[PDB]
Structure 1
Amino acid sequence: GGELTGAKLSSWNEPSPFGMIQVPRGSIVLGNKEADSLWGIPAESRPISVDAFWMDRTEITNAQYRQFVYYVRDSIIRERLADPAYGGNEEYKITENKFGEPVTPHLDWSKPIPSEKRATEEEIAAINSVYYTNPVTHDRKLNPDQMVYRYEVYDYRSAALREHQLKAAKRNLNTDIKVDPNAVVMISKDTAFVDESGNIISETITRPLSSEYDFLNTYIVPIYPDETCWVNDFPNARTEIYTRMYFNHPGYDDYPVVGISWEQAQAFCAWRSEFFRKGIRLPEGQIMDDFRLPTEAEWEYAARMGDSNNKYPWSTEDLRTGRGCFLGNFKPGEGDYTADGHLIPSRVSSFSPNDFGLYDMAGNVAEWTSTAFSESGLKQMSDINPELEYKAALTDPYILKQKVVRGGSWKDVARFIRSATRSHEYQNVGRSYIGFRCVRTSIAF
């Protein structure tokens, strides 16, 4: 043998994500130590520590989400092209390699989709299958009920739990206890499928723990933004113009995307992870982490620049610069949204960034986090990398499907744009004042 040298692994390459800044590991006291005493809300504070991660410089914009929408549209169109029901062209679905060996069927993204003017009747029908025309206004728009994205997520943390060991003998390390043969562990997972009628069937399956497939969750989510939020959020207002133009006007391309629910944000993050992985070369053994919504603790740490003395994403305690310019896009005056120059959201990066380099962590649009909402959630999370993760069952009461929202929006008063203030929203609800940005755990040494 010899002396004890090391079995060094193969060096990896870390690709720095585009549009993201690095947030270092550190500690912060989440919450505020003083209360308003007019809001009747006790002050809750808890010191926590987080590891380094990549965070999006700005909130996701209309064009960035339109990229996801267009990917879904193109994939569905290609699936229909290589389909006997609409077309039948086999060239849009590869099933064999150059040698004839059977392989996993998949789309051939190399060959361009037929152009509408140059397309044949079958190709035109397949292309139009994902569109919908208003019989009255004669307006052709992507069908929201057809823009559905399918994705699976493996629950590594649940599979790592000691109670979920696939072997019964390994679920208890106490030798005094004998493993009951009859003992059964019940596990819950999510699945979804498209039936012959075309309707999306989503279900939560509860069954005895028997295999790794017990830790795989499958979702088919309609991902087209809910543009009607503008009308629904504000009764007795002329906000239909935004319901018609905000997501469809080229001038709003760099404005944050709104009307996105928590589930749609998770689907977008999964699509972004898959898209990023497809376009990179990874040596053998390299393992990366996926894009995700931030935890509320991570978001609060990043908004306050890892400093417990900051109430807002800026060093000063005021809300305006020395010259009277506001530091964010919120509702500063009574019925006075425009005091900062903007009524509805504004182009990302319209104000000065953080010390970390982040824009619009206060105001503009409030942002989804991955944390489930609980009134005593700060006490129930951990000290390190705090998280309160809940995968609600479909038949669960609606009250259990609330997720934490952070930052404040264009319609919030200065209290709710404070970095320590927590809001919440139901996971299936989209609002004209809630957007989101993504994070990615960074392996740094």
Structure 2
Amino acid sequence: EPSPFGMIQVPRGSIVLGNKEADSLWGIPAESRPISVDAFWMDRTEITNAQYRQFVYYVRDSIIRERLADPAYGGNEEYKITENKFGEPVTPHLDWSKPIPSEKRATEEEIAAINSVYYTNPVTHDRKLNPDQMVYRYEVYDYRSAALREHQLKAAKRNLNTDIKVDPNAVVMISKDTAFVDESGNIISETITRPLSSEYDFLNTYIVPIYPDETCWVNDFPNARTEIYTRMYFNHPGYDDYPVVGISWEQAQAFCAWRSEFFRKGIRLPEGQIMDDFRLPTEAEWEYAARMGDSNNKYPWSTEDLRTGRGCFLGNFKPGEGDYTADGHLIPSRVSSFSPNDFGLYDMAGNVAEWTSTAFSESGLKQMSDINPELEYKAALTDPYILKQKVVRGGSWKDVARFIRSATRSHEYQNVGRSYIGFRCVRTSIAFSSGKA
């Protein structure tokens, strides 16, 4: 079995998915409805700085590979040209079996190509990766919207009710967002509302910068000093087993897509065929994996209190008023620091709040289905900023015990990336469990 490393197979089950009683002081309705979910693989630890650093190393590698591949910036022309071994004129997108670029010794053109994406500080003389030139380009296929009845290719197949004759000139409007790159280098993302004509109307290409917003440590924390945080939270070698923060939702999707690509490239297996890839966890999936699929589990630990028998704290949230370090940690602590739930998920409620796929609508629970429910809203460009609000769940280090309870929805804008928003890459498990419970 594949059984990806760092994953945990959470089985299928059901959860009440909410809280019945409502905090009158908070003044919320506290709406809930039961929901059942299937089995899937969830990574035990929030994606740390090490994994996202591997992702940015990969994207930097191919970025400079492409730059050196340009004839104007080195012209190595490795690629793969016609008559590849057994006369194969394959498309030369990029070559990755070429010798690794060598630091120190190189030609002037190769050094220039490598430094084209690096950034040196005029006043500090520190060289790092360019935030606006660390861009990841990927493609996703809208499988769910491609199989819809009204979105079928043949017009006569769009309505199975034979009472009304199908008009061949059906006016149906499709959506597609495919950020394309221009000659000036200013990556422009556009939406297209052309009428449904072919299968290409169901593939979305996304090119997005993926370097984390370190400045998040400063923008949302005024009148506080975080120089020791925004400077090298990512860059510190010792900050490897700590969850990454500042990731935008778009960058979260990009990284999950990259993880899917890496899984597909490695471990060649024709038997997998259409085997499922990685994605962000859904709201219902996340909550079910959190509360153990038990109604009585307010938090992702067996007991109902946030203190153990000896008074120790579980999860590095904010215990008391202005008491961020009462549990023992101030900033997002290292992963697997506290005692995990027996489901196998570390820091399930705590550390950094989690990105989740389903778009927040304040209807939410009472508007999705009952089997693997989720809301999909790939809002594009000229939409109100309110609709671009992906929901988040988990409770972070800054949030009080009220927000550490798993059954608490919270707003989040997909564009922004804050210093308290981690994320997980989750995959769907095709498991033939015999049941027999």
Which range, TM-score by smaller chain? over 0.9
Cα displacement string for residues 166-208 of structure 1 (whole angstroms, at most 9, x for unaligned residues): 0011111111110112222110101121111111011010011
Aligned alpha-carbon RMSD (Å): 1.1
Identity of aligned residues (%): 100
Match of 1:269 in 2: 256
Structure 2 residue aligned with 1:367, among 354, 372, 382?
354
CA contact (8 A) 2:354 2:421 kept: yes
Structure 2 residue aligned with 1:91, among 78, 83, 87?
78
Cα displacement string for residues 17-76 of structure 1 (whole angstroms, at most 9, x for unaligned residues): 110000000100001011110001111111001010000011000010000000000001
Deviation of 1:442 (Å): 0.3
Give the secondary-structure state (helix, strand or coil) at the position aligned to 1:398.
Answer: coil
CA contact (8 A) 1:330 1:363 kept: yes
CA contact (8 A) 2:42 2:427 kept: yes
Deviation of 1:95 (Å): 5.4
Q: How many residues align?
A: 432
Deviation of 1:92 (Å): 4.5
Cα displacement string for residues 65-101 of structure 1 (whole angstroms, at most 9, x for unaligned residues): 0000000000011001111121101124555511343
Give the secondary-structure state (helix, strand or coil) at the position aligned to 1:153.
Answer: strand
Cα displacement string for residues 109-164 of structure 1 (whole angstroms, at most 9, x for unaligned residues): 12233212111101101111110111000110100111000001011111100001
For the structure 1 residues 285 and 249, does the alpha-carbon distance in structure 2 shift closer, same or farther, using more than 3 Å as the test? Answer: closer
Partners of 1:364 and 1:23 lie apart in 2 by: 21
Partners of 1:242 and 1:16 lie apart in 2 by: 35
Match of 1:6 in 2: none
CA contact (8 A) 1:55 1:437 kept: yes
Structure 2 residue aligned with 1:420, among 407, 417, 420?
407
For the structure 1 residues 94 and 353, does the alpha-carbon distance in structure 2 shift closer, same or farther, using more than 3 Å as the test? Answer: farther
Structure 1 residue aligned with 2:309, among 319, 322, 333?
322
Give the secondary-structure state (helix, strand or coil) at the position aligned to 1:249.
Answer: coil
For the structure 1 residues 123 and 93, does the alpha-carbon distance in structure 2 shift closer, same or farther, using more than 3 Å as the test? Answer: farther
Identify the range of structure 1 (219-228 vs 185-194) with the bigger mean alpha-carbon deviation.
Answer: 185-194
CA contact (8 A) 2:149 2:158 kept: yes
Cα displacement string for residues 281-325 of structure 1 (whole angstroms, at most 9, x for unaligned residues): 223573211101000000000000111110000010111111110
CA contact (8 A) 1:79 1:93 kept: no
Partners of 2:79 and 2:103 lie apart in 1 by: 17
Match of 1:53 in 2: 40
CA contact (8 A) 1:329 1:410 kept: yes
Match of 1:296 in 2: 283
Give the secondary-structure state (helix, strand or coil) at the position aligned to 2:82.
Answer: strand
CA contact (8 A) 1:78 1:92 kept: no
Cα displacement string for residues 360-379 of structure 1 (whole angstroms, at most 9, x for unaligned residues): 11110000000000111110
Structure 1, unaligned stretches of length 5 or more? 1-13
CA contact (8 A) 2:276 2:427 kept: yes
Cα displacement string for residues 242-279 of structure 1 (whole angstroms, at most 9, x for unaligned residues): 00011111111110000001000000000000010001
Cα displacement string for residues 342-367 of structure 1 (whole angstroms, at most 9, x for unaligned residues): 01011100001112110111110000
Cα displacement string for residues 220-243 of structure 1 (whole angstroms, at most 9, x for unaligned residues): 000000000001111000112100
Structure 2 residue aligned with 1:252, among 216, 225, 239?
239
CA contact (8 A) 1:79 1:92 kept: no
CA contact (8 A) 1:329 1:363 kept: yes
Partners of 1:46 and 1:89 lie apart in 2 by: 60
Partners of 1:96 and 1:319 lie apart in 2 by: 66
Give the secondary-structure state (helix, strand or coil) at the position aligned to 1:361.
Answer: coil
For the structure 1 residues 354 and 285, does the alpha-carbon distance in structure 2 shift closer, same or farther, using more than 3 Å as the test? Answer: closer
For the structure 1 residues 92 and 410, does the alpha-carbon distance in structure 2 shift closer, same or farther, using more than 3 Å as the test? Answer: same
Give the secondary-structure state (helix, strand or coil) at the position aligned to 1:192.
Answer: coil
Residue 192 (structure 2) pairs with residue 219 (structure 1): no
CA contact (8 A) 2:80 2:91 kept: no
Give the secondary-structure state (helix, strand or coil) at the position aligned to 2:395.
Answer: coil
Structure 1 runs of 4+ with >4 Å offset: 92-96
Partners of 2:326 and 2:79 lie apart in 1 by: 54
CA contact (8 A) 2:71 2:77 kept: no
CA contact (8 A) 1:94 1:106 kept: no
Partners of 1:94 and 1:402 lie apart in 2 by: 45
Partners of 2:294 and 2:365 lie apart in 1 by: 18
TM-score (norm 2): 0.97
Partners of 1:166 and 1:59 lie apart in 2 by: 41
Give the secondary-structure state (helix, strand or coil) at the position aligned to 1:270.
Answer: helix
TM-score (norm 1): 0.95
Give the secondary-structure state (helix, strand or coil) at the position aligned to 1:100.
Answer: coil
CA contact (8 A) 1:78 1:113 kept: no
Residue 167 (structure 2) pairs with residue 144 (structure 1): no
For the structure 1 residues 285 and 177, does the alpha-carbon distance in structure 2 shift closer, same or farther, using more than 3 Å as the test? Answer: farther
Structure 2, unaligned stretches of length 5 or more? 433-437
Deviation of 1:106 (Å): 2.9
Identify the range of structure 1 (391-400 vs 113-122) with the bigger mean alpha-carbon deviation.
Answer: 113-122
CA contact (8 A) 2:80 2:90 kept: no
CA contact (8 A) 2:22 2:29 kept: yes
CA contact (8 A) 1:56 1:439 kept: yes
For the structure 1 residues 263 and 96, does the alpha-carbon distance in structure 2 shift closer, same or farther, using more than 3 Å as the test? Answer: farther
CA contact (8 A) 1:92 1:107 kept: yes
Residue 176 (structure 2) pairs with residue 189 (structure 1): yes
CA contact (8 A) 1:151 1:218 kept: yes
CA contact (8 A) 2:391 2:409 kept: yes
